[PDB]
Ligand binder design. Structure first.
Ligand SMILES: Nc1ncnc2c1ncn2[C@@H]1O[C@H](COP(=O)(O)OP(=O)(O)O)[C@@H](O)[C@H]1O
Ligand SMILES: [Cl-]
Ligand SMILES: [Cl-]
Ligand SMILES: [K+]
Ligand SMILES: [Mg+2]
Length: 378
């Protein structure tokens, strides 16, 4: 006490605490309200969060991310087998269970997905503690509505290992609805749609709420669609640009590409607020600096297809919920990618002008709700 709410995301995590009737989204040591769900291993240390992602470009093999794509799954799992091909780190099989293998202090080591995630939760726990100036023990941790028992169990174990007493595992969409106070009894049932576009996944959930009780009507989306795909479209655009101006292709330089990706991710965030953004990278390739810029319009074209496609899962969710657009009482934005103006237009146009619940930072909405629920449970 106080107990906190932690959003353990695929790419970013967020922790909040509810005090004096208000939720405080807690900033980390670097002043960031969300922290990368990254962990890195080196000859001398173990890095978590910002410190880990900041060195991902020079240490691709021992920097782990996406642990949430493995958590609660078996090695033989089809999705595990597919994802493994795309990760720079190794995933091994231990008695039918996946484990990430890395080099730490010169020796080989493997960790279960819940162990990597416990490291991320420990970081969030310490972040809350630095702010509260007290020890944090109780917490509510979130999971996608589609997680099964094994995944929920593994996420809870990750918390226990982090030294947290998990009060409860709740679904992200429900946490988001709770953040907006949509769980208050108000007569009859209400249909709420959660549009969650994160950095690596896209989830659309339709909930029916009556008497403070939630009913997941349907879920839709794409487990391999997120802000990270928008960054790639930008990376390819600039690889071509650098090639035209310099007669050089930086494609095979893993570090140069990762550093360009990082500059694009940052330019992207700026484009949600401004109509243009500057990209300036020192010594990108062979000592050549890359100073350029990109417009919001340009950014939207490079991603027009991906953006527009987010509406397919929305139509399917409605169909599976046996509901029509007009029957949705509230539309909630979750995920940092929903801060993109063009995406808000697409969703809004689809719902014929209906206003979107977007006052709470989408990438903080889940942690916000979990923080509210954690206080209640305490
Ligand atoms: N202002 C912004 N505009 C566009 N994208 C953003 C903005 N802020 C954060 N993002 C993106 O949101 C994604 C992940 O954050 P969320 O907070 O969505 O994480 P997670 O993937 O774990 O759910 C990233 O792709 C990140 O670049
Ligand atoms: Cl930190
Ligand atoms: Cl449009
Ligand atoms: K998150
Ligand atoms: Mg998320």
């Amino acid at each position: 006490g106080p107990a906190v709410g932690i959003d353990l995301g695929t790419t970013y995590s967020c922790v909040g605490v509810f005090q004096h009737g208000k939720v405080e989204i807690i900033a980390n040591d670097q002043g960031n309200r969300t922290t990368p769900s990254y962990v890195a291993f080196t000859d001398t240390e173990r890095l978590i969060g910002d410190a880990a992602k900041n060195q991902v470009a020079m240490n691709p093999t021992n920097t782990v991310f996406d642990a949430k794509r493995l958590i609660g799954r078996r090695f033989d799992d089809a999705v595990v087998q597919s994802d493994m091909k795309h990760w720079p780190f190794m995933v091994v099989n231990d008695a039918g269970r996946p484990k990430v293998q890395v080099e730490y202090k010169g020796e080989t080591k493997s960790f279960y997905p819940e162990e990597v995630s416990s490291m991320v939760l420990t970081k969030m726990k310490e972040i809350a503690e630095a702010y509260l100036g007290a020890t944090v023990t109780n917490a509510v941790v979130t999971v996608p509505a589609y997680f099964n028992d094994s995944q929920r169990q593994a996420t809870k174990d990750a918390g226990t290992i982090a030294g947290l007493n998990v009060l409860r595992i709740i679904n992200s969409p429900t946490a988001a609805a709770i953040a907006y106070g949509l769980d208050k009894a108000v007569g009859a049932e209400r249909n709420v749609l959660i549009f969650d576009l994160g950095g690596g996944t896209f989830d659309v959930s339709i909930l029916t709420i009556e008497d403070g009780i939630f009913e997941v009507k349907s879920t839709a989306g794409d487990t391999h669609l997120g802000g990270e795909d928008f960054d790639n479209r930008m990376v390819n655009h600039f690889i071509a640009e650098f090639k035209r101006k310099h007669k050089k292709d930086i494609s095979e330089n893993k570090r140069a590409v990762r550093r360009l990706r990082t500059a694009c991710e940052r330019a992207k965030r700026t484009l949600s607020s401004s109509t243009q953004a500057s990209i300036e990278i020192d010594s990108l390739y062979e000592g050549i600096d890359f100073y350029t810029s990109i417009t919001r319009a340009r950014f939207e074209e490079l991603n027009a297809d991906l953006f527009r496609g987010t509406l397919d899962p929305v139509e399917k969710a409605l169909r599976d919920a046996k509901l029509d657009k007009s029957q949705i009482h509230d539309i909630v934005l979750v995920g940092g990618s929903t801060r993109i103006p063009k995406i808000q237009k697409l969703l809004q146009d689809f719902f014929n002008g209906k206003e979107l619940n977007k006052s709470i930072n989408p990438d903080e909405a889940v942690a916000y709700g979990a923080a509210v629920q954690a206080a209640i449970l305490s």
